[PDB]
Amino acid sequence: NADTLEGSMAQLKKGLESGTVLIQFEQLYRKKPGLAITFAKLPQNLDKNRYKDVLPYDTTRVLLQGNEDYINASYVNMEIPAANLVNKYIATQGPLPHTCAQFWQVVWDQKLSLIVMLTTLTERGRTKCHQYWPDPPDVMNHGGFHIQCQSEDCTIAYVSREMLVTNTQTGEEHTVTHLQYVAWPDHGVPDDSSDFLEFVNYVRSLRVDSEPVLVHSSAGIGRTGVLVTMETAMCLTERNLPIYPLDIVRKMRDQRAMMVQTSSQYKFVCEAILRVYEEGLVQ
C-alpha cells in the first residue's frame, strides 16, 4: 500500500545501517496514553502482578469468571487486513505460585491448544517464572484442574511438552502443546538467530485459525513482543505486503504496553525480518 514489500525492505536496510530506525523505535511511546489501567492496581490484584509496573490495560485484559476476575494477561490481535487474516494471541506474564490456578483457568476457558513460553524458570539467581506444570510422571493440581505432563522432548533451543489438563469436577480433558524456548536471556536476544527462526516457523505450523496462541515470558512484554513481531512479518513477507516494524510494535503496544523491551531486541527482529525476506525470494 505505502510501498512495495521490496521497497519497505530497502528502507529497513538503509535505516538499520544509518541508523534512524533505532532512533524512531526509541521515540515510540511505551504505554498508549489514554488507555486506563485501574483493575491491575486494585488492592486485591496487586500480588497477582509479577512486576509492579508491567500491567494490562482495562480494555484488553483477559477476564476470568467469578469474584476475582483478574489475571495479568492481555488480548493481542495482529491484523493483516489486506489478507482477511487476524493472528490472535494472549500475552501474559510468567505465572506466580499463587496465580497458577488463574493461568490454567484461561487455558481451559478458551480451550487454548498452544502455550509458548519464552523464558527459563530462573536466570543467574533471579526467579523469572514459577513451574506451573509437573515434571513427569508427577501430577499437579491447580484450581480444580489436574495437570499431567504426557511427554517431554528437548532440542538445542527449546523443550516440547504435551500436557493433559483435566477438569476434576467433570472429568473433561483437554490436551495442550507447551513449547519452552530456553536459549533467550531476559532483556536480550536469542542466542542463535537460526534456532529462533526455526522455532517461530514451528509455532506458525501449530497455530489454529481464530484460536489465540498463549505467549508468555517473565514480564510477558519483551521476548513476547519480539516473537509476535516476527510471526507478523513472516505472514506479510509470504503475501508480498510491505513491513514497517515500528508500526507493528505500535499496534502491539496499543494492546499491551511496553511490547519489545530494548533497541537491541528491535534491532535483532529487524535483521531477522530482512533475512526471511531474502530467503523468501530464493523460496
UniProtKB/Swiss-Prot annotation:
Transmembrane segments: none annotated. It is found in: Cell membrane; Cytoplasm, Cytoskeleton. Disulfide bonds: none annotated. Residues 21-276 form the Tyrosine-protein phosphatase domain. Substrate binds at residues 186, 217-223, 261. Coiled coil: none annotated. The active site is at 217 (phosphocysteine intermediate). May act at junctions between the membrane and the cytoskeleton. Possesses tyrosine phosphatase activity. Belongs to the protein-tyrosine phosphatase family. Non-receptor class subfamily. This is Tyrosine-protein phosphatase non-receptor type 3. It comes from Homo sapiens (Human). The gene is PTPN3. The chain holds residues 628 to 908 of 913 of the full protein.
